[PDB]
Ligand binder design. Structure first.
Ligand SMILES: Oc1c(SC(F)(F)F)cc(SC(F)(F)F)c2cccnc12
Length: 133
């Protein structure tokens, strides 16, 4: 029941400072423009210890499956090859991606009827708000 309140299908309803986050990450111009237009569906499900998070949009369809605390390979929507570890910290899913000596952290939290995603790269934060689909 670890992630019960995350499970479901969620639709992006607002984004703030995502272009600057993508710049900080190293995403190039054309990908930033097309990715920034996307209104993804995030689909979260749990089967035993395995959590699956899908992102579906006109830009890309991606999927990760993982066990909390257990590092995995991830190819991101912008085509980074990263090493990821996801943990639960006080009811927040904390997802750290490492690549090329760099690091970014994505936090996913339930707040009221929303799922709030905070993406941080150094000093730059983007906040993406999802509601139930
Ligand atoms: O919502 C997100 C998109 S847009 C979409 F989903 F359509 F791929 C793209 C990326 S990778 C990038 F930031 F480098 F661009 C995201 C990373 C973390 C959370 N959300 C993300």
């Amino acid at each position: 029941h670890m992630c019960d309140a995350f499970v479901g299908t969620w639709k992006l309803v607002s984004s703030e400072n995502f272009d600057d986050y993508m710049k900080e990450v190293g995403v190039g111009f054309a990908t930033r423009k097309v990715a920034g237009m996307a209104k993804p569906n995030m689909i979260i499900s749990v089967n035993g210890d395995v959590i699956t998070i899908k992102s579906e949009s006109t830009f890309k369809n991606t999927e990760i499956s993982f066990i909390l605390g257990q590092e995995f390979d991830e190819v991101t929507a912008d085509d980074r090859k990263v090493k990821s570890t996801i943990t639960l910290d006080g009811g927040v899913l904390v997802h750290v991606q490492k690549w090329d000596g760099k690091s970014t952290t994505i936090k996913r939290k339930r707040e009221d009827d929303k799922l709030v995603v905070e993406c941080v790269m150094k000093g730059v934060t983007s906040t993406r708000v999802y509601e139930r689909a």
